Design a binder for these strands. Structure first.
Ligand SMILES: [Mg+2]
Ligand SMILES: [Mg+2]
Lengths: 165, 142, 141, 133, 157, 225
RNA sequence: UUUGAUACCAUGAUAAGGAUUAUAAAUUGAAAGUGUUAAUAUCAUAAUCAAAAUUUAUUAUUUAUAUUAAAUAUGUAUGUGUAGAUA
């Protein structure tokens, strides 16, 4: 039925008694509770699937609310929502990275403490060793590529590269 | 991919015609974004509420030198028509300009004013094979 | 997995063609929109065939008895105000209450596309004779 | 050494203090950032400002925070313990001894001991022992 | 740079690092973003104390503030790319080409499981598994039970 | 009877005869800030009008003190008056407020039967009074201290109202859905509809004697739970 | 004072694909290899953080009582369940 919800103030009753709505406002002050003013009275729908022992999927709690339009957009959804801080997302952010040991310590630090020195990555070492091997037979299939070119283009006052044949 | 239309042609596999979960396809290609509806005109591919504010992209947020094109989720405003200033949008091949201003555009996003897939086809971006396949489907004359 | 062939270059003067084509596709779309709004509203405003399926009850009954009596004397004005559009018609029948639970349960209504025909429709072919130049989603005459 | 200006932050970032993801030499920086301890941001912010002066004086007297400390003291003298504690929250810098005096003095007449104690312990051995008086 | 003295065999592995920073930016911006959203879109009065013209005004003030924040990370998580920390292979999450608890792509999961590197247990390829919960209602049910022990067993205060 | 900090009644500083600085009117900011024992910037936060017009407070009539300067009295804090229940006796009321009954009479003019009264005046002698307003509530001065700049701009730009909806909006029911709105929509009410007797009385048969079906004096919760 | 995994030649490795070890206390999925992985380098920064451009063998869509509300989400093909060929 379409009716006006109504409230009888206890001073007006022929016995004073504590009205359930009044109690509800108490409960809302204590655990601070948003009272949705536009909540339609007609829409009480339990989630049948999870709340009835008749379905194999029965958790005892209302897993989803059955409201078709409801979306991450709405201020109401935003107000009760778990922020991503310190969830698994953070755990992924930190522990899943390309070389897993760089999660535990600075490579240079480790290398310098354990070995006497910084060590190149395995890949780099491969390219290094290969250059040494193939520079020993053929020469001049090569190129000279640096980060900063000035050191080669104007070399120091000394520096007379040994002629090759 | 078979043909590389961008860099990603090299990195990505098609995996045949593969199914993705509902409304998550890796690449957002909105072919439907201009899809005429008189009765749904104000609800389709627009803001879910008319009390929402216009997006970020209708405003100059910081100190700018200038822009090349404005974003396509920008919404066409009476000033877009009236002011007589360049309004560009990035579409393909290059850019679409709103040159001929109309009030009928107002209040919709430029997504909706720019036809993504044109009925027009360049024969010169097509291989002879591809042109054949476009003649089979009854698109290109031959 | 074969190395992807390179895409040929774009075209010469195709940037102009694409600009022009989209430009006047939009200009055309303005009139297509104007016209389909005109159509949509003309449809909302004009009368429709009766929404209920007369082959079932309580509708089959002779037009001088039962539901038709209930309509001629109590509901007529309202049924005409809403132009026999099937949604408000069905709602009015719910609110008249003198039928009550039956509207959805015992009574049958015509399918969507048939119920949308203009009043006076004689042959079924009419569904297919409406204008296709206009974007109303079958809400046009 | 990197230093962040909170007044001058620009998109250009002239001092280049931000953590740029793709620049030359970035990688070890990114890795360092991902290894940082649970309070890193907070601790660094707090220790690079707020430190005992070379004279043995407390950092306690700052021009921009002074009226706030005054307000706290004032509030505590009129016996508003909650309002005072609520202003104590918004203090960026170490509060002067006078604040702690006022605040505990306010705790006395209502017998609040737990509160007097947490006040004291807050100002002491966290904030440089301003509270030990 | 410019492929001079590159340390890793795949250059794109670096993208994975970039991704991490994205999540970091989100942690830095989520609370802020969402508050500004909620206060902006609220049609009902904000409160007893803030109503009417003050509320309208404050709403616009806030969304103006939120638009001004350059670099604030608003991108929804399902639109971020998933890329392997090992071979930098990518996969769509929620698809059989991405494996969620190790967060590696199918390709790497396969490689790592077959040469023993991951410790898993093989179960018949066709069923639901050894697990009770999955055996009952499949993926959705197990999803639910996880919600139940993360949240619902608490009566919050 | 202990008082809560900053009672809900605002301290007002009138201009009046002021200090010996004038003996006529108070004028400068730092002056009133010395009087009320607060920062001048707080004093300015609270008063938007007197801060925008000028700093010499040219023509403006008063100042409002910052919330931290307000003093509560038992008078402003506790309700002077008490509601009377249907069943009430002077004995009952006295027990409720902890008064002695004679003291309750005294302020109420020796009244004996309370049946014709909505409110009985409460003696200052009362142990349990009611507080005028919920104490854990936040005073409005605080929330307005949060918004100070906005409240000054409201006056500068002369903003009476900012319309949330377009002019004709109620005419189109499915078009303007704010994102707080919920389905199914509620129909507007109708006068006699709640039960068959009321309806019959108003619409069908109009000499029907029973205008509504008997209404339990206690509250009936129609949506329940 | 250095030069390869790059847009580029630059070895390895896991897929799919039923054809005769049968009933009892018992599984209807196989090794012969399907982009991403370890010694051949000697043209080039091409990588997603949104809102984007159909030619690709390798894909089970909702078919006539009631039909667009939250991330933006598909305007098109009614034609005698009707060729050939296929699963
Ligand atoms: Mg192979
Ligand atoms: Mg990059």
């Amino acid at each position: 039925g379409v009716h006006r919800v109504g409230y009888t103030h206890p001073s007006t009753l022929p016995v004073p008694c504590a009205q359930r709505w009044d109690l509800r406002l108490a409960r809302a002050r204590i655990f601070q509770e948003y009272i949705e003013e536009k909540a339609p009275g007609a829409w009480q729908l339990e989630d049948e699937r999870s709340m009835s022992p008749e379905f194999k999927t029965f958790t005892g709690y209302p897993m989803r609310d059955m409201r078709p339009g409801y979306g991450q957009n709405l201020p109401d959804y935003i107000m009760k929502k778990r922020l991503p801080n310190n969830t698994h997302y953070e755990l992924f952010a930190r522990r899943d990275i390309p070389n897993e040991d760089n999660a535990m310590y600075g490579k240079y630090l480790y290398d310098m403490t354990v070995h006497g020195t910084s060590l190149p990555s395995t890949y780099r070492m491969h390219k290094d060793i290969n250059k040494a091997q193939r520079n020993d037979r053929k020469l001049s299939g090569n190129r000279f590529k640096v980060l900063c070119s000035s050191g080669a283009k104007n070399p120091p006052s000394g520096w007379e590269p040994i002629p090759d044949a | 991919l078979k043909i590389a239309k961008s860099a990603f042609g090299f990195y990505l596999a098609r995996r045949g015609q593969r199914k993705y979960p509902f409304l998550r396809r890796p690449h957002i290609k909105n072919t439907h974004s201009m899809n005429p509806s008189a009765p749904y005109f104000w609800s389709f591919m627009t803001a879910k509420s008319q009390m929402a504010f216009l997006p970020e992209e209708n405003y100059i947020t910081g100190d700018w030198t200038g822009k090349f094109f404005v974003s396509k989720r920008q919404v066409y405003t009476l000033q877009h028509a009236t002011s007589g200033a360049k309004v560009r949008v990035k579409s393909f091949p290059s850019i679409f300009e709103f040159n001929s201003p109309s009030r009928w555009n107002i209040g919709k996003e430029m997504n909706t004013l720019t036809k993504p897939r044109m009925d027009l086809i360049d024969e010169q971006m097509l291989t002879k094979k591809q042109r054949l396949d476009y003649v089979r489907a009854g698109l290109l004359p031959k | 997995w074969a190395k992807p062939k390179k895409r040929p270059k774009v075209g010469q003067g195709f940037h102009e063609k694409a600009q022009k084509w989209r430009e006047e596709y939009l200009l055309d779309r303005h009139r297509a929109l104007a016209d389909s709004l005109r159509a949509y509203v003309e449809f909302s405003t004009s009368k429709r065939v009766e929404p209920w399926d007369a082959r079932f009850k309580p509708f089959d009954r002779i037009e001088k008895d039962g539901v038709y009596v209930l309509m001629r004397y109590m509901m007529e004005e309202k049924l005409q105000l809403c132009n026999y559009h099937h949604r408000p018609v069905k709602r009015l029948f719910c609110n008249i209450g003198l039928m009550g639970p039956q509207i959805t349960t015992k009574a049958r209504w015509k399918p969507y596309r048939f119920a949308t025909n203009p009043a006076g429709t004689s042959k079924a072919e009419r569904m297919y004779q409406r204008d296709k130049t206009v974007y109303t989603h079958g809400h046009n005459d | 050494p990197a230093v962040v200006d909170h007044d001058n932050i620009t998109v250009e970032d002239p001092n280049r203090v931000g953590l740029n993801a793709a620049t030359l030499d970035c990688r070890g920086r990114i890795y360092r950032w991902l290894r940082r301890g649970p309070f890193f941001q907070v601790d660094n912010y707090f220790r690079r400002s707020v430190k005992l002066n070379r004279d043995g004086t407390l950092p306690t007297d700052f021009v921009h925070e002074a009226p706030l400390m005054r307000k706290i003291i004032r509030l505590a003298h009129r016996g508003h313990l909650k309002a005072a504690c609520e202003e104590y929250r918004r203090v960026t810098t170490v509060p002067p001894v006078e604040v702690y005096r006022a605040l505990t003095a306010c705790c006395v007449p209502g017998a609040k001991l737990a509160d007097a104690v947490s006040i004291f312990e807050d100002g002491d051995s966290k904030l440089f022992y301003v509270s030990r008086d | 740079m410019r492929h001079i003295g590159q340390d890793v065999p795949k250059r794109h592995t670096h993208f994975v690092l970039e991704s991490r920073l994205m999540y970091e930016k989100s942690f830095r911006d989520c609370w802020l973003h969402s508050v500004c959203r909620a206060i902006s879109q609220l049609d009902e009065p904000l409160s007893k104390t803030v109503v009417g013209t003050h509320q309208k005004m404050l709403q616009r003030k806030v969304t103006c503030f939120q638009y001004n924040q350059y670099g604030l990370f608003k991108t929804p998580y399902y639109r971020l790319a998933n890329v392997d920390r090992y071979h930098a292979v990518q996969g769509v999450a929620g698809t059989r080409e991405w494996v969620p608890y190790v967060n590696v792509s199918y390709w790497t999961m396969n490689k790592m499981v077959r040469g023993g590197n991951l410790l898993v247990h093989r179960v018949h390829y066709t069923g639901w598994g050894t697990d009770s919960h999955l055996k009952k209602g499949g993926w959705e049910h197990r999803w639910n039970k996880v919600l139940q022990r993360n949240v619902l067993q608490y009566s919050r205060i | 009877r202990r008082l809560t900090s900053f009672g809900a009644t605002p301290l007002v500083l009138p201009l009046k005869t002021t200090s010996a600085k004038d003996g006529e009117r108070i004028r400068t900011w730092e002056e009133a800030a010395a009087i009320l024992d607060c920062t001048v910037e707080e004093l300015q936060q609270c008063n938007g009008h007197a801060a925008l017009t000028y700093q010499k407070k040219e023509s403006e009539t008063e100042l409002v003190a910052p919330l931290s300067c307000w003093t509560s009295t038992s008078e402003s804090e506790f309700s002077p008056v008490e509601r009377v229940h249907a069943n009430d006796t002077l004995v009952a009321i006295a027990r409720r407020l902890q008064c002695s009954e004679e003291a309750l009479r005294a302020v109420n003019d020796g009244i004996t039967d309370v049946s014709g009264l909505d409110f009985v005046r409460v003696p200052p002698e009362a142990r349990r009074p009611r507080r005028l307003v919920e104490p854990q509530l936040r005073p409005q001065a605080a929330t307005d201290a949060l918004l100070a700049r906005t409240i000054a701009e409201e006056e500068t730009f002369k903003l009476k109202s900012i319309p949330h909806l377009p002019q004709n909006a109620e005419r189109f029911p499915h078009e303007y859905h704010t994102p707080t709105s919920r389905f199914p929509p509620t129909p507007s009410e109708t006068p006699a509809t709640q039960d068959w007797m009321a309806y019959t009385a108003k619409y069908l048969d109009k000499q029907f004697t029973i205008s509504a079906e008997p209404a339990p004096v206690y509250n009936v919760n129609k949506l329940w739970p």
